[PDB]
């Protein structure tokens, strides 16, 4: 498969799974499915790529289905970025 070109959207309020992880449920809005979801976590400084993405190689099968992505965010403020470019969705998350 290949990286996904288009935009994404969040389908549900992010939930804490409390094995230490957080799940993000996202929908693919552009074209080129199936494809890989371009996702990365960012620091409080909003530039360096910290943390880790649990779900091994998340896949957007189609434009209707929701991709479930588990991840390990650092305590406090973190920025989750889904997709590429300026229509990259950016989620300011806070871990307690």
């Amino acid at each position, epitope marked *: 498969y290949t990286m996904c070109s288009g935009k994404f*959207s*969040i*389908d*549900k309020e992010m939930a804490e799974t409390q094995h230490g992880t957080t799940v993000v449920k996202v929908k693919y809005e*552009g074209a080129g499915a199936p494809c890989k979801v371009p996702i990365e976590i960012r620091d409080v400084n909003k530039e360096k790529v910290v943390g880790r993405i649990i779900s091994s190689t998340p896949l957007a099968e189609n434009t*209707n289905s929701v991709t479930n992505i588990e991840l390990e965010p650092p305590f406090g403020d973190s920025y989750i970025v889904i997709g590429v470019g300026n229509s990259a969705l*950016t989620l300011h998350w806070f871990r307690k």
Partner: single-chain antibody
Amino acid sequence: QVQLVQSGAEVKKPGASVKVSCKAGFNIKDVYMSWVRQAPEQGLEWMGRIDPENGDTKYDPKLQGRVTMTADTSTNTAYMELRSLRSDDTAVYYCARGWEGFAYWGQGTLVTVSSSDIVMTQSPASLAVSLGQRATISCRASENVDKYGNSFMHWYQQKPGQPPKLLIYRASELQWGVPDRFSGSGSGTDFTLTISSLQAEDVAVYYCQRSNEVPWTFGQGTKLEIKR
């Protein structure tokens, strides 16, 4: 291609209860299923939303106690039960899906009965502009509508006897297929929808909507018309 099919239009006596079904072509477990009512010639009123994964139901305070929203994740069907019906409740009952705007809607079910709190302010109530000319509709929320660093403000178009159409979501993001001439700006509390060049297709009612925290209140609507 449409993913929501609703039950047939029911006629009920005052004081009765009604149950509307909504069958989805996708897995409702990973989704926010909402119900929206629309009285004849009045605006859109959000009723509530269910998370079918955990059955979590949040309702609108207007209807609180009268509505019961359920979901069967096995049959990917969502339900809505409304009790102690008044002639008042005669409306079209829409079944919808999504968080950053309701991208997916049902055909509607006409129910005919016969024998934190936020204020969303849409301006104007109606307006006429000439073809090809620029048109602007505004929405002002009483509180903040940001969440996760994004403004959860959406815009809908609704032509008569038709379900609404999500146009703009996440304040500025344009839904797939929507013409270039449509645009959304704004932040914090003031947002605006703008049609750079008015086309005859655009004559419709427009609704703005918040979705960051419940209720997912709609604006009162803006009837857009042609001059001359």
